[PDB]
């Protein structure tokens, strides 16, 4: 079935970090997975990643640093509107000095710190810290 593709991509990344692996393969690939990985890599929680291209949905190989502590998904994509955001990042995040919430806004997939910097709400996807 695989209702949600991002959920199992993130759970398979997170099951390997607990194990000390240097790399993972995750499949199928998707547009939202690549954007979420780019957001997670711009900050420095993962290394580079490579996309393997079959003529189907494809597969990704990720180089894992040892910096990632936990990444995860919020199961229904709730609407979040720049006033709920503080009450959201007081449940999901472990502190006020690190850890990011990832949300899709009409200006792309980004983090909360940029969402407030651009005055935009959207839908929550997940978090990593």
């Amino acid at each position: 079935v695989r209702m949600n593709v991002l959920a199992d991509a993130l759970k398979s990344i997170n099951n390997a970090e607990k194990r000390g692996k240097r790399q993972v393969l995750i499949r199928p690939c998707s547009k939202v997975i690549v954007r979420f990985l780019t957001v997670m890599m711009k900050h420095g929680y993962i290394g580079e990643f490579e996309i393997i291209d079959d003529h189907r949905a494809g597969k990704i190989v990720v180089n894992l640093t040892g910096r990632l502590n936990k990444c995860g998904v919020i199961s229904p994509r709730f609407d979040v509107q720049l006033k709920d955001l503080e009450k959201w990042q007081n449940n999901l995040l472990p502190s006020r000095q690190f850890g990011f919430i990832v949300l899709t806004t009409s200006a792309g997939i980004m983090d909360h710190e940029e969402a407030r910097r651009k005055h935009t709400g959207g839908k929550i996807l997940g978090f990593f810290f």
Binding site: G20, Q23, I52
Partner: protein, 84 residues
């Protein structure tokens, strides 16, 4: 589980040990072959996992038998794997 395996550049032989689909990119294990009847003479092109009965033209009026896997040639000599 060496804890540092390389997934992007696998082995040239351990990537043909895996299932046809569980490998990095899918590939069939089957192939096409030239077959020669020693009687009439043509170049019939046959699928390895035939599952059909093949005849040449007239002559032997058999050239392969179907099975649960790869088809077996009766006495079809000289069979060549075709390539890419």
């Amino acid at each position: 589980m060496p804890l540092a395996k390389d997934l992007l550049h696998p082995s040239p032989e351990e990537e043909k040990r895996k299932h046809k689909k569980k490998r990095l990119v899918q590939s069939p294990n089957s192939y096409f072959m030239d077959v020669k009847c020693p009687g009439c003479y043509k170049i019939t092109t046959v699928f390895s996992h035939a599952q059909t009965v093949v005849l040449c033209v007239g002559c032997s009026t058999v050239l392969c038998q179907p099975t649960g896997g790869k088809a077996r040639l009766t006495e079809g000599c000289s069979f060549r794997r075709k390539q890419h």
